[PDB]
Amino acid sequence: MVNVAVIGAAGGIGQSLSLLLLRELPFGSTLSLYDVVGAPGVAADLSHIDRAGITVKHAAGKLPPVPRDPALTELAEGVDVFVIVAGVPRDDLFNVNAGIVMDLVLTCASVSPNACFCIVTNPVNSTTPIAAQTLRKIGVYNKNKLLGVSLLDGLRATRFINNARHPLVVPYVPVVGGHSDVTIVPLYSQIPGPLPDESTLKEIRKRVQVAGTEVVKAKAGRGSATLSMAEAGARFTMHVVKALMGLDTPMVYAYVDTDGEHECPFLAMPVVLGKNGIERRLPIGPITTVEKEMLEEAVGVVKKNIAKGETFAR
Amino acid sequence: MVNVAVIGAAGGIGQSLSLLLLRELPFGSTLSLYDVVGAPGVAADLSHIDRAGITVKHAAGKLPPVPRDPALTELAEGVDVFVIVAGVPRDDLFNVNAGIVMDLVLTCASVSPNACFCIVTNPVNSTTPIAAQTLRKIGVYNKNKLLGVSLLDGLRATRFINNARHPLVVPYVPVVGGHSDVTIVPLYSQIPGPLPDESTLKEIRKRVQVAGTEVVKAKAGRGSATLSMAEAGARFTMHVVKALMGLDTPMVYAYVDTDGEHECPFLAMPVVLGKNGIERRLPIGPITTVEKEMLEEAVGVVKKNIAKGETFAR
Amino acid sequence: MVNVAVIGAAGGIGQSLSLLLLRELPFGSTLSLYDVVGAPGVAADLSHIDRAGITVKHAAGKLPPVPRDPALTELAEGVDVFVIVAGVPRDDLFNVNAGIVMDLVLTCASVSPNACFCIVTNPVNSTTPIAAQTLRKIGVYNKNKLLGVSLLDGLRATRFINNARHPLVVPYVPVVGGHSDVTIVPLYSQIPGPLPDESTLKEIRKRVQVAGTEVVKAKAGRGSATLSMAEAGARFTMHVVKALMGLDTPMVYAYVDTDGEHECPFLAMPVVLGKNGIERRLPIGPITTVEKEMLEEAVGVVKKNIAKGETFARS
Amino acid sequence: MVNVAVIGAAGGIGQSLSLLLLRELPFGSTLSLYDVVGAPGVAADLSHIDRAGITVKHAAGKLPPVPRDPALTELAEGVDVFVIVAGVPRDDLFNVNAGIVMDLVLTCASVSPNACFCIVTNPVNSTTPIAAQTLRKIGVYNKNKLLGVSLLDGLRATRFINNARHPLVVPYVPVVGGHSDVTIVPLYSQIPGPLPDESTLKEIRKRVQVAGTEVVKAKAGRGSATLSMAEAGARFTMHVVKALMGLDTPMVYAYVDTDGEHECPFLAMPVVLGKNGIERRLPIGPITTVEKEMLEEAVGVVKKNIAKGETF
Amino acid sequence: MEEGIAMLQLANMAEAALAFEAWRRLGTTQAENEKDCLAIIALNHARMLDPKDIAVHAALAVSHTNEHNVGAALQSLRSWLLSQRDCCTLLYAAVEMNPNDPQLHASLGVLHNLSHRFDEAAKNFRRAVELRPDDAHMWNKLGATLANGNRPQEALEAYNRALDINPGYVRVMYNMAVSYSNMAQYPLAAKHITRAIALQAGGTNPQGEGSRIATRGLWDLLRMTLNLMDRSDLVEASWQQDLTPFL
C-alpha cells in the first residue's frame, strides 16, 4: 500500500535506517534502496530476512555520478515517501551536500511529484530550503509534503532530562528553533513535573546544543554519530508512513515551512501529521524569559542559514 | 536486571547488534560494549538514544592486542550473557578467528563463570567446540549454557519457503545439522501446509545451502552479510535473555552439545530454554528419505569439522 | 476504514466481545452495536474509554421483537463485518435460535450484501447452513464471506496440550470436523514435539470433546461459558478485519462452505483469509488411523446436523 | 512472579476485569479469584483460554457471608496485589459497602501484610480511609502500599478533550481532587496544544464531573458503567504489577494518602510507582484561577467525605 | 437468682451479671452491655441445656444479626420457628397464620435488618412496638433499625423513651452516641460514651479479661470521637482507662 525509498542506503546511516525500516514497516509495504555504490550488496542482505509481506527492491547508479541517473528515474516511479540520506562523510561540506541534494530531489520529484520528502542531510537548516527551491523550479511544491528531520535533538533532550530527574521519566521534550549549534532551543518549562533548578538546566541546554561534537571527539575525528541519526530517521519515517494511510494522526516537531505563523520562513515548529502531510501547524506556546531570549538569538541564525541556502540555490 | 556484554561491538555486525539490543532489551537492564578499537565512539553514540531505563557501559581497548587485557577483566564483572561477535573483516581466517575466540572466552569466563556464552562468529562448527575446550580447561564448563547461533539459516529457509508458497505463511522452519554450506539441512517435511512439488524443493534446499556465497558475490567480494547476521544474533540473544528472566520458555534451534541423543558430539538440534540455560533437548523428529541422506552427509562433514576444531585447541 | 457491527451486543457474550473489540480495532474504525434491550446502555459505556480514533454507534430495537426491525436497516448501512452473536441464555433451543438468526441475517444482508458474516450463536453445525439458505433466498450468496466461529476448540486443545507437555509450548493445535460434542476432532499428530503417550491423548481428546458441559456443571446449571466465547469471537473478528484491509493473510480453522473438496458440504477445515474473504481451501493433511475413524464419525454426525438445519430453514 | 488476587470476581465489574487481566499479566504469574457466589464458574471459564505461562487459582464462597472466611484465608496466602472490587449493584450505598470492605481488608491483610491494596469499591473518597483505619487497627499499615483507583476520571477527561480538539490528540489528562460529583477537578491547563475556549471548557469540565449519572440514566436505572470501570481497574493493576517487578516506574494519578504535603490527608495527587509501592509524591503544579477556585471548593467536600468515612 | 431478679428491675446489670433459666437470664443480660461474645456463649450453653426455649433462640438470632453472621441468625430464627429466603417463606407463613404476634413482627424486623432492607424492618418494628408499647427491647431494635437506616431524625421516640422505661440500658447510650456522631454532634456523643462506660464498670468494677475486651471497643470509639474535636489531652488520659477526668 505504501512505497518507501531510501536514497543513499549503502552508507553508514542508510544501512541501519534500512534495517530498522524493514523490521518495522507494515504488512504489504515495499522498500526501495538506491546508492551510487553498494546498493546491490545491501539489497541482497535484507531479502534474506523473512519479514512476510515486504518486498525489497533496489537500483544501482553508475559509479561516476551523472545528472538524472536513468536507474533512479525508474525506481522513483510509484514512491510515496522519499528519505534523502545521501551525504559525503564547513562550507566545503555544504556545497557538495547541497549539489547532491539538488540533483537527487530534481531526479526524484520529476517522476513522483506527490510524494513526501524527508531530508536527513546534515545541514538541515540550509538544505531544506534548497529542496524547496528545487521543487519550486520544477513546478510542483507542497509546503505540507516537505519536512526536515530534527528528532535527534528531541531524543538527546529527553535522555538528558530523564537522566537528571530519575525517579521519573517523560515521553518527549519540546525542541524548537533549528538544528545546528545555537539554533537548538529546548523547552523544559513545557514538560510535566518539577524541574532540576536553574544553573543546572542551563548546563543541560548547553549539552543538548553541543552533544553532536562530543561523539565526534570521542571517535578522535574518525566519524560522527550514525546509529543515533539512523534511529531518529527511522522513527520519523515510521510516523510519516503511519499517518499517510490513516493509522495515526501524530504531533511531531520538525523543520517545516511556516506559511505565516512565525516571522522566520523555515522554523522547526510543532505540527500534526495527516493523510495529506501536514494537517495543522500549532503555535509554539508559552515560554519563560530565558527561553524567549534563546529563541530570539536562534531565529537570527536561522534567517541567515535560509538566506545562504536560497542563495546557493540561485 | 540482566547484564549483556557484546564483545567486539565496534565491528560491522556488532554495531547493528548493539543498536537492536538497546532498542529491544527489557527495562532495567544494562548494556556492556567492548572492542580493541572504536568502543568509546559507539558507546557515546548509543547513549544519546532516550530509551528510559537502560544504562550503557563500555571498556576501551588497548595497544596492538595483548592476551587477557585488564579492561575486559574489569568490564566482564557481573555479566549474564556474553555475545561474542569478533572476527577479521579460507584456513588462515579460521586460524585467526580461533586464536581470538579462545583468548576472548578465557578472559571473560574467569570472572563470571556462570554466564551464558553465545558464539556468533562464523566457523561455528569449529569455534563452539573450541569454546567448550577452553571452558573445560578453566574448570567451569556447563553444557546447558553454551549456545552457537545458527538462526540465519532458519530465517533464510523461512523466507524462501514463504516466497515459494505465497500467500501461505509459516512462522519458522526447522533446520538441523551445522552452519556451513553442506552441513545445514532444512526439514520442510515437518511444516504445515501443502509443500510444492519435488525437483523444486531441491532447488530451494540448494539455495539455502549456498545462500551465504550469494551475498558475497553481490557485494563484489568487498564484505559479507552483516545486517541479517546482526538481526539473527539480536533475536537469539533476546530469546536467551527472556528465558533467563523467567518471562518465556522458548523452543529454539541452536548448535549445542549433545549429551546422548545424536552420535555427533556437537549437533544442532531443537532445544527448550529456561532459567538455567538448556532445559529439554527434543529429538529431531520424523524425516523423509532424502532428508535422511542429507543428514547423513551433514553429520559426516560435521565430524571432520569438530575434529579440526578441537585439534587446534591443543 | 472498517465498520464492525456487533448484533446482540448487550447480552452476556456480546458485552465482553464489544469491550475486547474496542481495545483492538485499528485506528480509524467504527463500532455499531445493536440489541433489542440494553443497546444504549452498553453504547454509552464504551464511549467514555479514550481510545482515540474509534467511533461508537448504536441502534436500539423494540421491546416487542418485530421482524425486519427499522433500526437495524439503518444501522447496517455501510458495514463490512457482521458479528451475529444473539441467542437466548436441545430441541427447545434450536427452534428459538434458528428463527432469530434467520431474521437477523435476512435484515442485515438486505442493505449490505457484500459484507462478511461471522456466526457466533451456538448450534453451529446447524446455524451456518441456515444463514447460507437465507442468503441464497435473498439472491446474493458468497461462500467466501460466510464463516462459522469454531475457534473455541483450538484454545481448549492448545491449553490442554500445553498443560500436559510443559514447558514445551505450541502456539496452536489444528481442530477439524464440527463443533458440538463428538464432531470435534483435534489433530495432535501434526504439531511439533514428542507427543506424550497413547491412552493419555485419548482422555485429553475426550476432555476437549465435552469441555463445554464442564463449565455448566461448575456453574450449577446457571449459565455457560461466556468469557472464553467472547475471547474466541474477538480473536476471529480481529483476524477477519486485519485480513480485510490487507494487513495480514492468516491461516485459520473455520466452519466454512466446502465447495468441492470434502464430501461434507459444510466441514471445518483450514483456510487462508484475504482481501475478498477466503482465498485458499487447504486439505486436512496426513492423519493417523486413530483420527481417521474419529473424523468418519464426525462427518457422519455433521451430515445429519446440516440436514436438520436445512430442513428447518426451508420450512 | 506476582500473585494478583481479584476479590469479587463474579460480579459485573469483576468478570470483565479478570478477563482483561488474564490477557495482560506477564508470563509466569498467577491469577487468584474469590467471590461469595459464582467463583467456580469463572475460574473454570478462564482456564480454557490458552494463555501459556499463567495459572488460574480460585477459592469457593460460602453460605450467607460469615466474617473472616476460611476460604479467603487459604487463598490470600502469598499474594502480592489485592484488587478489592465488591459491593451491592445514594446514602445507603455507603454503609453496606463499608462493612464488607472492612471485613475483606481485615481477612486479607492478616495473612499478607506486605501486599498492595487497590480499592475499586464505589464511595472512593470514603472507603480508602476506611481501608486505612482497618489496616491501622491490625498494626500494619504502609502509606505507600494503599491506593485508590480513580483512573476513570482521567479516561473520561481524555476522551472528552480529544473529541473537541481533533485531530490533535493527547495521551492523558491530569485530574486531581476526588472521585465524586463535585470533587473531580480536571486540569486542562497542563496539556500541550491550544485549549478550545472558555465557556466551552467549562461545559467539558461539568460533563466530566457528572458523567457517571449519564450511564445510569441511559440504562434506565438498571445498572452502572461496568466496562469502563473494569478497563480502568485493569490498567491501574497492570501499572502496579509492572512497577513491582522493576519493569517500569510509571507516573499515575491515584487517591493516595498525602504524607504531609497537602493539608487534606487523602487527596488524589500524581505519584511515581516503584518496587516498594510509592517512590515520590509530586506536587499538583501551577493552575489557573478557575481551577484554583474549583480545587478550593472540592477540598472541603473531600474533607467531609474523609471524616464521614473515618467516623464509621 | 433472687438477687439478680431484684437487681435487674432497678436498671443496673453489671452487678446482676456478676452475681450469675440462669444461663438464659445471664445471656439475655450480657446482650445489653456490648458483650456479644459472652452473651453468645451463654446462649449456646442455654440452648444445649434446652433447645426448646424460644427466648434463647430469639436472643441468639438478635446477637447473630448484631455480629453480621447471616447463616447463624437464619438458623436461630428457624429453630425459634420450629420450637413452637425459605426461612423468609416460613416467617411469612407464620405471620399470615397469626397476624397479631409481636414476636413474629420482631423476627420479621430482625430478618429484614441483616438483609439490608431497612424499610420493611422499620415497618415491622413499628407494628410490633405498636402492639406492645411496654417492651424496652422491641423499641431498642426499632431504634437500632432507624439509626442503621440513616437519617437519625426523632432523637428517639422510644429507645430513649425505653430509657423512661429502662434508664440503665447501655445499648441506649451506645446508639445515641453513634447517631450523634452521624450528625457531627461530638461533645454529647462522648458524654454518652462515658456514661455507657461508667454503667459497664458499675460499682464492683469487674476486671475480667472478657469485660476489658468488651469495653475496649467503646474506649476505641471514645478515642475516635475525641480525635475529631482535637482533644489530645483527653486522648492521652484515655490510654489509662481512667474515666474520672471524663466524668
CSV table of N, CA, C and O in Angstrom, one decimal, chain A residues 53-86:
chain,number,residue,atom,x,y,z
A,53,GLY,N,5.4,-10.3,3.7
A,53,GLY,CA,4.6,-9.2,3.2
A,53,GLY,C,5.4,-8.0,2.7
A,53,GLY,O,4.8,-7.1,2.2
A,54,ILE,N,6.7,-8.0,2.8
A,54,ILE,CA,7.5,-6.9,2.4
A,54,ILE,C,8.5,-7.3,1.3
A,54,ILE,O,9.1,-8.3,1.3
A,55,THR,N,8.5,-6.5,0.2
A,55,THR,CA,9.3,-6.7,-1.0
A,55,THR,C,10.4,-5.7,-1.0
A,55,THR,O,10.2,-4.5,-0.7
A,56,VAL,N,11.6,-6.1,-1.2
A,56,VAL,CA,12.8,-5.2,-1.2
A,56,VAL,C,13.3,-5.1,-2.6
A,56,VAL,O,13.9,-5.9,-3.2
A,57,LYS,N,13.0,-3.9,-3.2
A,57,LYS,CA,13.6,-3.5,-4.5
A,57,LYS,C,14.8,-2.7,-4.3
A,57,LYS,O,15.2,-2.3,-3.2
A,58,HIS,N,15.5,-2.5,-5.4
A,58,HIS,CA,16.8,-1.7,-5.4
A,58,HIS,C,17.1,-1.3,-6.8
A,58,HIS,O,16.5,-1.8,-7.8
A,59,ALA,N,18.0,-0.3,-6.9
A,59,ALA,CA,18.6,0.2,-8.2
A,59,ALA,C,20.0,0.7,-8.0
A,59,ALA,O,20.2,1.5,-7.0
A,60,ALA,N,20.9,0.4,-8.9
A,60,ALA,CA,22.3,0.9,-8.7
A,60,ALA,C,22.6,1.9,-9.8
A,60,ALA,O,22.3,1.7,-11.0
A,61,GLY,N,23.2,3.0,-9.3
A,61,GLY,CA,23.6,4.1,-10.2
A,61,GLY,C,25.1,3.9,-10.6
A,61,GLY,O,25.9,3.2,-9.9
A,62,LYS,N,25.5,4.5,-11.7
A,62,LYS,CA,26.8,4.4,-12.2
A,62,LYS,C,27.8,5.1,-11.2
A,62,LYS,O,27.5,6.1,-10.6
A,63,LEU,N,28.9,4.4,-11.0
A,63,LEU,CA,29.9,4.9,-10.0
A,63,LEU,C,30.4,6.3,-10.3
A,63,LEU,O,30.5,7.1,-9.3
A,64,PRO,N,30.7,6.7,-11.5
A,64,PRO,CA,30.8,8.2,-11.8
A,64,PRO,C,29.5,8.9,-11.8
A,64,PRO,O,28.7,8.6,-12.7
A,65,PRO,N,29.2,9.7,-10.8
A,65,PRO,CA,27.8,10.3,-10.7
A,65,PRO,C,27.5,11.1,-11.9
A,65,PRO,O,28.3,11.8,-12.5
A,66,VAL,N,26.2,11.0,-12.4
A,66,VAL,CA,25.8,11.7,-13.5
A,66,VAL,C,24.4,12.4,-13.2
A,66,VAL,O,23.6,11.8,-12.4
A,67,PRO,N,24.1,13.5,-13.8
A,67,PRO,CA,22.8,14.1,-13.6
A,67,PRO,C,21.7,13.3,-14.2
A,67,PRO,O,21.9,12.6,-15.3
A,68,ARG,N,20.6,13.2,-13.5
A,68,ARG,CA,19.4,12.5,-14.0
A,68,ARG,C,19.8,11.0,-14.3
A,68,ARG,O,19.7,10.6,-15.4
A,69,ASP,N,20.2,10.3,-13.3
A,69,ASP,CA,20.6,8.9,-13.5
A,69,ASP,C,19.4,8.1,-14.0
A,69,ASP,O,18.3,8.1,-13.3
A,70,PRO,N,19.5,7.3,-15.1
A,70,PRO,CA,18.3,6.6,-15.6
A,70,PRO,C,17.9,5.5,-14.6
A,70,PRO,O,16.7,5.1,-14.7
A,71,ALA,N,18.7,5.0,-13.7
A,71,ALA,CA,18.3,4.0,-12.8
A,71,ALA,C,17.4,4.6,-11.7
A,71,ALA,O,16.4,3.9,-11.3
A,72,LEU,N,17.8,5.8,-11.2
A,72,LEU,CA,17.0,6.4,-10.1
A,72,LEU,C,15.6,6.8,-10.7
A,72,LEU,O,14.6,6.9,-10.0
A,73,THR,N,15.5,7.2,-12.0
A,73,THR,CA,14.3,7.6,-12.6
A,73,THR,C,13.3,6.4,-12.6
A,73,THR,O,12.1,6.6,-12.4
A,74,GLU,N,13.7,5.2,-12.8
A,74,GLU,CA,12.9,4.0,-12.8
A,74,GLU,C,12.4,3.7,-11.4
A,74,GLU,O,11.2,3.3,-11.2
A,75,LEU,N,13.3,3.7,-10.5
A,75,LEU,CA,13.0,3.4,-9.1
A,75,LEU,C,12.0,4.4,-8.5
A,75,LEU,O,11.2,4.0,-7.6
A,76,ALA,N,12.1,5.7,-8.9
A,76,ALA,CA,11.3,6.7,-8.3
A,76,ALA,C,9.8,6.6,-8.7
A,76,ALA,O,9.0,7.3,-8.1
A,77,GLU,N,9.4,5.7,-9.6
A,77,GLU,CA,8.1,5.6,-10.1
A,77,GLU,C,7.2,4.9,-9.0
A,77,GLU,O,7.6,3.8,-8.6
A,78,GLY,N,6.1,5.5,-8.6
A,78,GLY,CA,5.3,4.9,-7.6
A,78,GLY,C,5.7,5.0,-6.1
A,78,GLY,O,5.0,4.4,-5.3
A,79,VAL,N,6.7,5.8,-5.9
A,79,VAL,CA,7.2,6.0,-4.5
A,79,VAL,C,6.3,7.0,-3.8
A,79,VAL,O,5.9,8.1,-4.3
A,80,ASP,N,5.9,6.7,-2.5
A,80,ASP,CA,5.1,7.6,-1.7
A,80,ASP,C,5.8,8.5,-0.8
A,80,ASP,O,5.4,9.6,-0.5
A,81,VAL,N,7.0,8.1,-0.3
A,81,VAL,CA,7.8,8.9,0.6
A,81,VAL,C,9.3,8.7,0.3
A,81,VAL,O,9.7,7.6,0.0
A,82,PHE,N,10.0,9.8,0.2
A,82,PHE,CA,11.4,9.7,-0.1
A,82,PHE,C,12.2,10.1,1.1
A,82,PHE,O,11.9,11.1,1.8
A,83,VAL,N,13.3,9.4,1.4
A,83,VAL,CA,14.2,9.6,2.5
A,83,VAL,C,15.5,9.9,1.9
A,83,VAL,O,16.2,9.0,1.4
A,84,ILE,N,16.0,11.2,2.1
A,84,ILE,CA,17.2,11.6,1.5
A,84,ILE,C,18.3,11.5,2.5
A,84,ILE,O,18.4,12.3,3.4
A,85,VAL,N,19.1,10.4,2.5
A,85,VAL,CA,20.2,10.2,3.5
A,85,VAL,C,21.5,10.1,2.8
A,85,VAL,O,22.4,9.4,3.2
A,86,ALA,N,21.6,10.9,1.7
A,86,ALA,CA,22.9,10.8,0.9
A,86,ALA,C,23.7,12.1,1.2
A,86,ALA,O,23.3,13.2,0.8
